[PDB]
Amino acid sequence: GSGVDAIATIVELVREVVEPVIEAPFELVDIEYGKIGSDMILSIFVDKPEGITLNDTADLTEMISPVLDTIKPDPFPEQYFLEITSPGLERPLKTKDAVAGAVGKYIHVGLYQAIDKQKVFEGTLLAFEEDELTMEYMDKTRKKTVQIPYSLVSKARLAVKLLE
Structure with missing residues (x-):
C-alpha cells in the first residue's frame, strides 16, 4: 500500500464517470478489478428495479466504453479484461x-x-x-x-x- 496508485485511481474516475452518463434507470451497484491468469478483469456491478438481462449488459458497457479509455493518468499495459454484470440478489433460482x-x-x-x-x-x-x-x-x-x-x-x- 501507498499514496499513489492506478488501481485505486481508476475506481475514483470510473465512479466519477459512471454517474454523469447512465443517469438511471440502471443504478450503479459497485466496481472492482480481479486477477485472471494474466489479465486485469474489470467488473462493473449494476442493479435494476426489476428486469435487466444479457441484452442490457451489452448496452450498458457500450455506454461506459466511451468513458473507459480516458481514465488518465493511467495507461494500462495492454492485457486487461472488462465485464459487466448485475447482482440481482446473491443466489437466485x-x-x-x-x-x-x-x-x-x-x-x-x-x-x-x-x-x-x-x-x-x-x-x-x-x-x-x-x-x-x-x-x-x-x-x-x-x-x-x-x-x-x-x-x-x-x-x-x-x-x-x-x-x-
Whole structure:
C-alpha cells in the first residue's frame, strides 16, 4: 500500500464517470478489478428495479466504453479484461443448480397459475431430490409441507424466514 496508485485511481474516475452518463434507470451497484491468469478483469456491478438481462449488459458497457479509455493518468499495459454484470440478489433460482444447492432456505415463488390454489407463496426449501423440492409453504396464515415440480417458476427469489 501507498499514496499513489492506478488501481485505486481508476475506481475514483470510473465512479466519477459512471454517474454523469447512465443517469438511471440502471443504478450503479459497485466496481472492482480481479486477477485472471494474466489479465486485469474489470467488473462493473449494476442493479435494476426489476428486469435487466444479457441484452442490457451489452448496452450498458457500450455506454461506459466511451468513458473507459480516458481514465488518465493511467495507461494500462495492454492485457486487461472488462465485464459487466448485475447482482440481482446473491443466489437466485435461475437454474435447478441453485435449487438443488440451496436446500435449507426460505424461498418465495410466483406462478402464472398456481401450485396449490395460490399464485405466490412463501416457503422454506428443506431439500431437493428426484427433480422435486420439498418445502414448507406459507399462505393465508397456513404453514404446511408441499412438493413443488420443476418447470413452473416465474418469480422465484431468495428469502430468509425471520431474522432471529
